[PDB]
């Protein structure tokens, strides 16, 4: 079986999708593995933190050209593997395939797009149809996404998640207390963690997304202090410079899809947390 996974990965690296058959297999095993993981998955450094990819497969390959090949380089992706991009199938399958082959080298979180309703509005669903002739590959993956850990704690100091903070969650314990094995709800803690955005208005605000909330610096400082965190590391938001600091550096956004939707013209970045939790950023443009 291991020789197989290696081949599947060799294939996916040539941008060649796996078969409905194999995806079903890859997903069943990925579930097995992902169930044992926590809502606040412990991740020890060194490890490179990545933001949104959104099916931009060739930019993912650019990401590996810059941060190193797996499993040599450890990776933590904060979700949003599908939609918008042209290769949602190749992208998410390569990533899940890396996770099943190297549980300890790769960590994948759930983003607001690793869900059933949004994937039928922005790509993934239809791409699966154009490539497999039926919704099975989509059901195998959307079912799998229910097992994706909502957040990761690196060295018990750096809290990572796709979206952001929730007014109904003040401690890492509150998060561990949620049942993440379900579709993303339209309201609540689980929803907010995947939908909220840091803001430059104080306290809690109305999210322009129509889900989750906005939260100012004051809220971050409290969340950080109450949880012995040095930083909140998230994605979910297009950031022209690739990465962006805010809230007197209590929060950092990391977007990994250069030139989003193939029209934004933004750089992409990944964040390297070394053996000492010392951080450094790598900005990159779309691969030629």
């Amino acid at each position: 079986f291991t020789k197989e996974l290696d081949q599947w990965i060799e294939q996916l690296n040539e941008c060649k999708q796996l078969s409905e058959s194999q995806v079903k297999s890859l997903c069943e095993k990925a579930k097995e593995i992902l169930t044992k993981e926590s809502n606040v998955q412990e991740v020890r450094c060194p490890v490179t933190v990545c933001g949104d990819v959104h099916g931009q497969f060739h930019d993912l390959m650019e990401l590996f050209r810059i941060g190193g090949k797996s499993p040599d380089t450890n990776y933590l992706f904060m979700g949003d593997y599908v939609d918008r991009g042209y290769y949602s199938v190749e992208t998410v399958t390569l990533l899940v395939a890396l996770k099943v082959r190297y549980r300890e080298r790769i960590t994948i979180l759930r983003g607001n797009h690793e869900s059933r309703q949004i994937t039928q509005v922005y790509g993934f669903y239809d791409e699966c149809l154009r490539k497999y002739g039926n919704a099975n590959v989509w059901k195998y993956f959307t079912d799998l996404f229910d097992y994706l850990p909502l957040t990761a704690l690196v060295d018990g100091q750096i809290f990572c998640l796709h979206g952001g903070l929730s007014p109904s969650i003040d401690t890492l314990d509150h998060i561990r207390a949620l049942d993440r094995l379900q579709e993303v709800p339209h309201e609540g803690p689980m929803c907010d963690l995947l939908w909220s955005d840091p803001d430059d208005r104080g306290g809690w605000g109305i999210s322009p997304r129509g889900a989750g909330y906005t939260f100012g610096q004051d809220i971050s400082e409290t969340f950080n202090h109450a949880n012995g965190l040095t930083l909140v590391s998230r994605a979910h938001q297009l950031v022209m410079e690739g990465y962006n600091w805010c809230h007197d550096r209590n929060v950092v956004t990391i977007f990994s899809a250069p030139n989003y939707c193939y029209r934004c013209g933004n750089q992409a970045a990944i964040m390297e947390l070394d053996d000492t939790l010392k951080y450094s950023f790598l900005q990159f443009d779309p691969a030629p």
């Binding site: 060194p46 190193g68 040599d72 380089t73 390297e272 070394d274 053996d275 000492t276």
Partner: peptide, 8 residues
């Protein structure tokens, strides 16, 4: 070197 990227 303290960085594993360099040691590798």
């Amino acid at each position: 070197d303290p960085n594993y990227l360099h040691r590798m």
